[PDB]
Design an enzyme around this catalytic site. Structure first.
Site, PDB file in Angstrom:
ATOM      1  N   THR A 152       0.959  -1.157   0.027  1.00  0.00           N
ATOM      2  CA  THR A 152       0.090   0.096   0.084  1.00  0.00           C
ATOM      3  C   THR A 152       0.865   1.351   0.070  1.00  0.00           C
ATOM      4  O   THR A 152       0.949   1.987  -1.099  1.00  0.00           O
ATOM      5  CB  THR A 152      -0.989   0.046   1.222  1.00  0.00           C
ATOM      6  OG1 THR A 152      -1.956  -1.146   0.991  1.00  0.00           O
ATOM      7  CG2 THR A 152      -1.611   1.447   1.314  1.00  0.00           C
ATOM      8  N   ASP A 319      -3.788   0.406  -5.642  1.00  0.00           N
ATOM      9  CA  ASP A 319      -2.294   0.314  -5.245  1.00  0.00           C
ATOM     10  C   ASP A 319      -1.651  -1.065  -5.680  1.00  0.00           C
ATOM     11  O   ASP A 319      -0.623  -1.194  -6.453  1.00  0.00           O
ATOM     12  CB  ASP A 319      -2.012   0.407  -3.681  1.00  0.00           C
ATOM     13  CG  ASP A 319      -3.034  -0.251  -2.793  1.00  0.00           C
ATOM     14  OD1 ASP A 319      -3.883  -0.803  -3.197  1.00  0.00           O
ATOM     15  OD2 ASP A 319      -2.775  -0.230  -1.560  1.00  0.00           O
ATOM     16  N   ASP A 700      22.119   1.313  -9.613  1.00  0.00           N
ATOM     17  CA  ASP A 700      21.078   2.470  -9.652  1.00  0.00           C
ATOM     18  C   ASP A 700      20.177   2.426 -10.969  1.00  0.00           C
ATOM     19  O   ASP A 700      19.484   3.474 -11.049  1.00  0.00           O
ATOM     20  CB  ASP A 700      21.731   3.904  -9.580  1.00  0.00           C
ATOM     21  CG  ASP A 700      22.504   4.399 -10.405  1.00  0.00           C
ATOM     22  OD1 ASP A 700      22.845   3.406 -11.550  1.00  0.00           O
ATOM     23  OD2 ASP A 700      22.791   5.552 -10.599  1.00  0.00           O
TER      24      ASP A 700
HETATM   25  C1  LIG Z   1      14.136   7.598 -11.387  1.00  0.00           C
HETATM   26  O1  LIG Z   1      14.089   8.972 -11.363  1.00  0.00           O
HETATM   27  C2  LIG Z   1      14.801   9.614 -10.556  1.00  0.00           C
HETATM   28  C3  LIG Z   1      14.391  11.043 -10.978  1.00  0.00           C
HETATM   29  O2  LIG Z   1      14.621  11.238 -12.354  1.00  0.00           O
HETATM   30  C4  LIG Z   1      16.221   9.273 -10.567  1.00  0.00           C
HETATM   31  O3  LIG Z   1      16.884   9.452  -9.212  1.00  0.00           O
HETATM   32  C5  LIG Z   1      17.929  10.664  -9.360  1.00  0.00           C
HETATM   33  O4  LIG Z   1      19.169  10.410  -9.496  1.00  0.00           O
HETATM   34  C6  LIG Z   1      20.217  11.236  -9.659  1.00  0.00           C
HETATM   35  C7  LIG Z   1      21.589  10.614 -10.052  1.00  0.00           C
HETATM   36  O5  LIG Z   1      22.129  10.153  -8.573  1.00  0.00           O
HETATM   37  C8  LIG Z   1      20.459  12.028  -8.455  1.00  0.00           C
HETATM   38  O6  LIG Z   1      20.914  13.430  -8.627  1.00  0.00           O
HETATM   39  C9  LIG Z   1      21.922  13.986  -8.068  1.00  0.00           C
HETATM   40  O7  LIG Z   1      22.998  13.766  -8.701  1.00  0.00           O
HETATM   41  C10 LIG Z   1      24.132  13.828  -7.833  1.00  0.00           C
HETATM   42  C11 LIG Z   1      25.223  12.690  -7.861  1.00  0.00           C
HETATM   43  O8  LIG Z   1      26.060  13.125  -8.865  1.00  0.00           O
HETATM   44  C12 LIG Z   1      23.684  14.058  -6.162  1.00  0.00           C
HETATM   45  O9  LIG Z   1      24.663  14.026  -5.131  1.00  0.00           O
HETATM   46  C13 LIG Z   1      22.923  15.192  -6.233  1.00  0.00           C
HETATM   47  O10 LIG Z   1      22.177  15.313  -4.990  1.00  0.00           O
HETATM   48  C14 LIG Z   1      22.734  16.608  -4.160  1.00  0.00           C
HETATM   49  O11 LIG Z   1      24.196  16.514  -3.806  1.00  0.00           O
HETATM   50  C15 LIG Z   1      23.899  16.940  -2.166  1.00  0.00           C
HETATM   51  C16 LIG Z   1      25.218  16.436  -1.558  1.00  0.00           C
HETATM   52  O12 LIG Z   1      25.395  15.068  -2.119  1.00  0.00           O
HETATM   53  C17 LIG Z   1      22.575  16.386  -1.714  1.00  0.00           C
HETATM   54  O13 LIG Z   1      22.538  16.599  -0.321  1.00  0.00           O
HETATM   55  C18 LIG Z   1      21.465  17.305  -2.377  1.00  0.00           C
HETATM   56  O14 LIG Z   1      20.134  16.377  -2.787  1.00  0.00           O
HETATM   57  C19 LIG Z   1      22.002  17.748  -3.751  1.00  0.00           C
HETATM   58  O15 LIG Z   1      20.848  18.251  -4.605  1.00  0.00           O
HETATM   59  C20 LIG Z   1      21.949  15.211  -7.462  1.00  0.00           C
HETATM   60  O16 LIG Z   1      20.507  15.531  -6.773  1.00  0.00           O
HETATM   61  C21 LIG Z   1      19.021  12.388  -7.813  1.00  0.00           C
HETATM   62  O17 LIG Z   1      19.308  12.466  -6.469  1.00  0.00           O
HETATM   63  C22 LIG Z   1      17.946  11.336  -8.073  1.00  0.00           C
HETATM   64  N1  LIG Z   1      16.720  11.730  -7.575  1.00  0.00           N
HETATM   65  C23 LIG Z   1      15.778  10.856  -6.702  1.00  0.00           C
HETATM   66  C24 LIG Z   1      14.599  11.526  -6.094  1.00  0.00           C
HETATM   67  O18 LIG Z   1      16.013   9.715  -6.428  1.00  0.00           O
HETATM   68  C25 LIG Z   1      16.557   7.930 -10.915  1.00  0.00           C
HETATM   69  O19 LIG Z   1      17.630   7.705 -11.680  1.00  0.00           O
HETATM   70  C26 LIG Z   1      15.518   7.201 -11.768  1.00  0.00           C
HETATM   71  N2  LIG Z   1      15.649   5.898 -11.847  1.00  0.00           N
HETATM   72  C27 LIG Z   1      15.594   4.997 -13.056  1.00  0.00           C
HETATM   73  C28 LIG Z   1      16.076   3.736 -12.919  1.00  0.00           C
HETATM   74  O20 LIG Z   1      15.449   5.740 -14.079  1.00  0.00           O
HETATM   75  C1  LIG Z   2      -3.401  10.139   5.451  1.00  0.00           C
HETATM   76  O1  LIG Z   2      -2.224   9.492   4.884  1.00  0.00           O
HETATM   77  C2  LIG Z   2      -2.481   8.296   5.483  1.00  0.00           C
HETATM   78  C3  LIG Z   2      -3.207   7.201   4.707  1.00  0.00           C
HETATM   79  O2  LIG Z   2      -3.806   7.395   3.437  1.00  0.00           O
HETATM   80  C4  LIG Z   2      -4.690   6.228   3.128  1.00  0.00           C
HETATM   81  C5  LIG Z   2      -3.179   5.916   5.151  1.00  0.00           C
HETATM   82  C6  LIG Z   2      -2.442   5.523   6.654  1.00  0.00           C
HETATM   83  C7  LIG Z   2      -1.610   6.629   7.183  1.00  0.00           C
HETATM   84  N1  LIG Z   2      -1.179   6.227   8.238  1.00  0.00           N
HETATM   85  C8  LIG Z   2      -1.286   5.086   8.914  1.00  0.00           C
HETATM   86  N2  LIG Z   2      -1.918   4.222   8.155  1.00  0.00           N
HETATM   87  C9  LIG Z   2      -2.521   4.344   7.212  1.00  0.00           C
HETATM   88  N3  LIG Z   2      -3.064   3.165   6.423  1.00  0.00           N
HETATM   89  C10 LIG Z   2      -2.710   2.727   5.222  1.00  0.00           C
HETATM   90  C11 LIG Z   2      -3.378   1.094   4.980  1.00  0.00           C
HETATM   91  C12 LIG Z   2      -4.677   0.939   5.184  1.00  0.00           C
HETATM   92  C13 LIG Z   2      -5.055  -0.405   4.943  1.00  0.00           C
HETATM   93  N4  LIG Z   2      -5.621  -1.002   5.823  1.00  0.00           N
HETATM   94  S1  LIG Z   2      -7.014  -1.770   5.767  1.00  0.00           S
HETATM   95  N5  LIG Z   2      -7.434  -2.363   4.160  1.00  0.00           N
HETATM   96  O3  LIG Z   2      -7.094  -3.255   6.427  1.00  0.00           O
HETATM   97  O4  LIG Z   2      -8.191  -1.322   6.444  1.00  0.00           O
HETATM   98  C14 LIG Z   2      -4.818   1.319   6.578  1.00  0.00           C
HETATM   99  C15 LIG Z   2      -3.425   2.125   7.164  1.00  0.00           C
HETATM  100  C16 LIG Z   2      -1.795   7.905   6.633  1.00  0.00           C
HETATM  101 CA   LIG Z   3      24.860   3.127 -12.266  1.00  0.00          CA
HETATM  102 ZN   LIG Z   4      -3.082  -4.813   2.205  1.00  0.00          ZN
END
Ligand SMILES: *[C@@H]1O[C@H](CO)[C@@H](O[C@@H]2O[C@H](CO)[C@@H](O[C@H]3O[C@H](CO)[C@@H](O)[C@H](O[C@H]4O[C@H](CO)[C@@H](O)[C@H](O)[C@@H]4O)[C@@H]3O)[C@H](O)[C@H]2NC(C)=O)[C@H](O)[C@H]1NC(C)=O
Ligand SMILES: COC1=C(OC)Cc2c(ncnc2N2CCC(CNS(N)(=O)=O)CC2)C1
Ligand SMILES: [Ca+2]
Ligand SMILES: [Zn+2]
Ligand SMILES: *[C@@H]1O[C@H](CO)[C@@H](O[C@@H]2O[C@H](CO)[C@@H](O[C@@H]3O[C@H](CO)[C@@H](O)[C@H](O)[C@@H]3O)[C@H](O)[C@H]2NC(C)=O)[C@H](O)[C@H]1NC(C)=O
Ligand SMILES: *[C@@H]1O[C@H](CO)[C@@H](O[C@@H]2O[C@H](CO)[C@@H](O)[C@H](O)[C@H]2NC(C)=O)[C@H](O)[C@H]1NC(C)=O
Ligand SMILES: *[C@@H]1O[C@H](CO)[C@@H](O)[C@H](O)[C@H]1NC(C)=O
Length: 817
Positions: A152, A319, A700
């Site tokens: 979920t 979900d 990654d």
């Molecule tokens: C699914 O989508 C995601 C978003 O498109 C992708 O994840 C992203 O991956 C990149 C590559 O690592 C990452 O970006 C960053 O690159 C730097 C590494 O060179 C990283 O360090 C940077 O971040 C920061 O640096 C400082 C100090 O380290 C941090 O504290 C701060 O965050 C600062 O910004 C830079 O952001 C992203 O982090 C990342 N995003 C997320 C949310 O994970 C995935 O690649 C993608 N997956 C696939 C399989 O396509």
């Molecule tokens: C508002 O955002 C939140 C939620 O948005 C939906 C859900 C949720 C949160 N915190 C704890 N538990 C949660 N729940 C997820 C799973 C959910 C299935 N349980 S069930 N189907 O047996 O009744 C019951 C618990 C917070």
């Molecule tokens: Ca890689």
């Molecule tokens: Zn369930």
């Protein structure tokens, strides 16, 4: 005198009574309950209530004056004025939206039914009239693929971020982060800690571009994320009756335009609750399905009352699915490990293992020990231990530190715990299994102005929904794992036209260089006819080149999207290739197997012919590999394949067409090219192939930088070599098996990211015939072409006549059997 209508709670002369004392005396009028009591407990009008004297304790009214006072029950007009309900109206198309001022961009509402497996609608559609009419009038897919683990919190948060869990950080309802040395629980204060929630939920995306949001329950909507809450949100309370949640969202949709949200969520706990408690095939689930169907009806009926039923874009979604658990299909690790007290094992089908002593031993602990201890212990074992980087790349379940370094892959219907004490009822319904299992597949229906009508779309992934909701709200999507434009086929008027990604540097050339015919240390099989004049055999006419390109690159050449990179195209008769001078290896070969092409059993071990287009290097010589225990080699384009003879294609033995290959992996590679490729070629009347190495040392899902790769070379016989983490294969034939791969109107693809491992302990080769296990390992490790593109830095099919959106659709497809 026979009825309570208009006299609830008043004294009577005429026989039957309408006061609470009547029940004990059994002298109530026959309609006392329906007329006087029920209205305190129900949200519906019925034939008893139409024109009722207003009651003060009634939850809504069916009184003649109800429309003036504006508190009619939602079904008032249907029941009491004989009009048709939303479900009773035939479908009619919504080409122009009919929206009030403020909804120049129409609202989107994400409506989640927890644990609605796709199968529930396949099978019980006849009992679910409303969801069935949305399917009929709207955009539907028989199966929307959830993210692993099929739980979920992970999937809900994935839907609204477009991120894999490994990236959004919510990998389960229960987690340990070692960097934080904190635990995540839904029962705990850490649930509210923004450090856990990564990425950008759509309600944040919307706020930054000036759209307000109303969330009646969603994971993360009660957490300050990038310093923002939804404009309206509700503290999660599962006891709030469903009717009250739907009525609240309908209140929000009547707010004045300045404060009225554009993005809404609705969430119900059914049919997940009933699914666990009584099993997915049960009277309780049928009743829950009917209940949620009715609640969807209440929403549509409400939107009709507000003239918003040809305005609002509804996404009805779930979900994950639901599976029948069994106590006879539950594995206990203590049977293999003894009653040890040093490990904590997360139970269920997505089981993981972590040392007790954390954060101290989290990295130091002997995972590989337990891994091997628990491998191939039984025949047809129903679980498989995996270090997280060895899990199929399609699962995208490794990057996050919150993912325990040892994971388990469970078979359908099977779950795993340390011991029977540390798990709930084994006989319950469950989920969390591989996101390609049928019973884990999820619900998607799109209905509204923005979506097509009576369209059944091919299976797509819930990570693609974020971009779709961005398009529906004219938002710029934050960076996510959806391929923007892959779902343009769902939309009446796509707002984003994708373009193929542009190649950074055009190809460098590898021209023939006059050099000595040097010794490589090869004892070639005598049958093989060597390359007698290289400069002659590889100075091709533009006429000869046109023929080769058309046969080997019918979809165009793979383009390279890597920044600091220098590749050169190498031409041959049966195959073309992109060679990296930087890593002494091809990034890709392209060839085409035709229906009646011949595959030789003639040996070609310890045979290589020098390629005078690149400098000779020690790792290009049979000598480097001769009785080398540490690494061997293999060929991308197969020498086994001859178009001209029934012998061996000599050109495939060039030094340019070899990759480092562990001896163990040669079993897989040799079986693929000898047996399977022949069968695939016959079955599909020809198959274009592209294969190549993969370097993902960061695990990654992305091709590693050249900079990173320089530090990851191994030193073997005093030489610097780069050994692939994986090998990719992309098979391409036509949907119509009458046409061959060179002339397809429509492409049928099948792709693999095969892990490159020093043993085949993954497959449990012992007392088994070779054929079985290789096919099974390929199936487990299949992948989207998009998965290959991400992990190689390549981009395929760029010369196809098809529009780009249709290609993205094709590239994001994952095959299921
Ligand atoms: C699914 O989508 C995601 C978003 O498109 C992708 O994840 C992203 O991956 C990149 C590559 O690592 C990452 O970006 C960053 O690159 C730097 C590494 O060179 C990283 O360090 C940077 O971040 C920061 O640096 C400082 C100090 O380290 C941090 O504290 C701060 O965050 C600062 O910004 C830079 O952001 C992203 O982090 C990342 N995003 C997320 C949310 O994970 C995935 O690649 C993608 N997956 C696939 C399989 O396509
Ligand atoms: C508002 O955002 C939140 C939620 O948005 C939906 C859900 C949720 C949160 N915190 C704890 N538990 C949660 N729940 C997820 C799973 C959910 C299935 N349980 S069930 N189907 O047996 O009744 C019951 C618990 C917070
Ligand atoms: Ca890689
Ligand atoms: Zn369930
Ligand atoms: C979680 O949601 C549940 C269900 O909405 C809440 O329980 C319900 O609370 C209402 C009032 O909040 C109770 O109703 C009555 O309220 C009046 C107040 O004047 C009082 O006179 C009545 O005696 C009665 O208490 C109702 O009993 C209760 N349960 C049900 C069955 O509806 C609960 O408040 C919510 N909050 C939490 C955090 O649990
Ligand atoms: C990491 O967290 C663990 C568990 O919370 C810490 O162990 C606690 O240590 C504090 C004082 O340092 C004690 O008062 C608690 O009783 C301990 N809790 C438990 C359940 O053992 C550990 O000290 C923390 N820090 C590091 C970095 O190891
Ligand atoms: C695995 O190690 C455990 C200790 O956790 C031990 O009880 C068991 O004998 C070992 N199993 C083997 C050697 O496969």
């Amino acid at each position: 005198v026979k009825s309570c209508k208009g006299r609830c709670f008043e004294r009577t002369f005429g026989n039957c009574r309408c006061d609470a004392a009547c029940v004990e005396l059994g002298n109530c009028c026959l309609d006392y309950q329906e007329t006087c009591i029920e209205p305190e407990h129900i949200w519906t009008c019925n034939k008893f209530r139409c024109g009722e004297k207003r009651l003060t304790r009634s939850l809504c009214a069916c009184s003649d004056d109800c429309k003036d006072k504006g508190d009619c029950c939602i079904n008032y007009s249907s029941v009491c004025q004989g009009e048709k309900s939303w479900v009773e109206e035939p479908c009619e198309s919504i080409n122009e939206p009919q929206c009030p001022a403020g909804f120049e961009t129409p609202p989107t509402l994400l409506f989640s039914l927890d644990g609605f497996r796709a199968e529930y609608l396949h099978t019980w559609g006849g009992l679910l009239p409303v969801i069935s009419k949305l399917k009929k009038c709207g955009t539907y897919t028989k199966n929307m693929r959830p993210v692993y683990p099929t739980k979920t919190f992970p999937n809900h948060y994935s839907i609204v971020t477009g991120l894999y869990p490994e990236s959004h950080g919510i990998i389960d309802n229960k987690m340990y982060d070692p960097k934080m040395n904190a635990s995540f629980s839904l029962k705990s204060k850490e649930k509210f800690n923004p450090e856990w929630y990564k990425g950008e939920p759509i309600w944040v995306t919307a706020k930054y571009q000036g759209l307000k949001s109303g969330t009646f329950f969603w994971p993360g909507s009660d957490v300050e994320i990038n310093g923002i809450f939804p404009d309206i949100y509700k503290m999660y309370n599962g006891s709030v009756p469903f009717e009250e949640r739907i009525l609240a969202v309908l209140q929000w949709l009547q707010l004045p335009k300045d404060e009225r949200p554009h993005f809404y969520t609705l969430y119900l706990e059914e049919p997940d609750s009933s699914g666990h408690s009584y099993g997915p095939v049960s009277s309780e689930v049928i009743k829950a399905l009917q209940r949620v169907d009715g609640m969807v009806g209440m929403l549509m009926d409400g939107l009709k009352e507000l003239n918003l039923h040809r305005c609002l874009n509804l996404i009805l979604i779930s979900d994950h699915g639901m599976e029948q658990g069994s106590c006879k299909k539950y594995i206990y690790l203590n049977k293999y490990l003894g009653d040890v007290k040093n490990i904590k094992v997360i139970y269920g089908p997505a089981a993981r293992l972590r040392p007790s002593d954390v954060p101290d031993k989290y990295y130091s602990f002997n995972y590989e020990g337990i891994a091997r201890n628990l491998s191939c212990r039984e025949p047809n074992q129903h679980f498989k231990p995996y270090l997280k980087h060895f899990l199929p790349k399609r699962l995208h379940f490794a990057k996050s530190d919150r993912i325990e370094p040892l994971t388990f892959y469970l078979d359908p219907q099977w779950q795993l715990a340390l011991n029977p004490s540390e798990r709930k009822y084994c006989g319950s319904g469950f989920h969390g299994s591989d996101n390609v299992f049928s019973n884990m597949q999820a619900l998607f229906v799109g209905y509204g102005p923005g979506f097509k009508h009576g369209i059944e779309a091919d299976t797509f992934e819930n990570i693609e929904v974020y971009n779709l909701m961005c398009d529906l709200l004219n938002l710029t999507p934050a960076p996510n794992n959806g391929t923007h434009g892959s779902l343009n086929h769902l939309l009446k008027n796509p707002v984003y036209t994708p373009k193929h990604p542009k190649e950074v540097h055009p190809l460098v050339q590898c021209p023939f260089t006059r050099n000595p015919r040097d010794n490589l240390g090869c004892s070639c099989n005598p049958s093989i006819l060597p390359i007698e004049d290289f400069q002659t055999q590889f100075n091709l006419t533009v006429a000869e080149e046109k023929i080769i390109k058309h046969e080997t690159l019918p979809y165009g050449r793979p383009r390279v999207l890597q920044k600091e990179n220098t590749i050169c195209l190498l031409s041959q008769h049966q195959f073309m290739s992109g060679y990296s001078q930087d890593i002494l290896m091809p990034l890709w070969t392209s060839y085409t197997v035709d229906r009646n092409d011949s595959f030789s059993t003639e040996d070609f071990s310890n045979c290589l012919y020098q390629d005078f287009r690149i400098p000779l290097s020690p790792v290009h010589k049979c000598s480097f590999y001769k009785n080398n225990t540490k690494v061997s080699y293999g060929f991308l384009s197969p020498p086994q394949l001859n178009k001209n003879s029934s012998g061996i294609y000599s050109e495939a033995l060039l030094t340019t067409n070899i990759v480092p290959m562990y001896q163990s992996f040669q079993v897989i590679w040799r079986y693929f090219h000898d047996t399977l490729l022949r069968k695939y070629a016959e079955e599909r009347n020809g198959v274009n192939v592209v294969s190549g190495p993969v370097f993902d040392f960061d695990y990654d899902g992305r091709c590693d930088s050249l900079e990173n790769l320089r530090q990851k070379r191994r030193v073997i016989r005093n030489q610097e070599i780069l050994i692939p983490t994986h090998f990719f294969i992309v098979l391409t034939s036509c949907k119509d098996t009458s046409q061959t791969p060179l002339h397809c109107e429509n492409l049928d693809t099948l792709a693999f990211i095969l892990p490159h491992r020093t043993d085949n302990s993954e497959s449990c080769v012992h007392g088994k015939h070779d054929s079985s296990w290789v096919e099974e390992l390929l199936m487990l490790h299949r992948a989207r072409i998009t998965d290959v593109e991400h992990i190689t830095g390549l981009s395929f099919y760029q010369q196809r006549k098809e529009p780009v959106s249709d290609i993205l659709k094709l590239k994001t497809h994952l095959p299921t059997f």
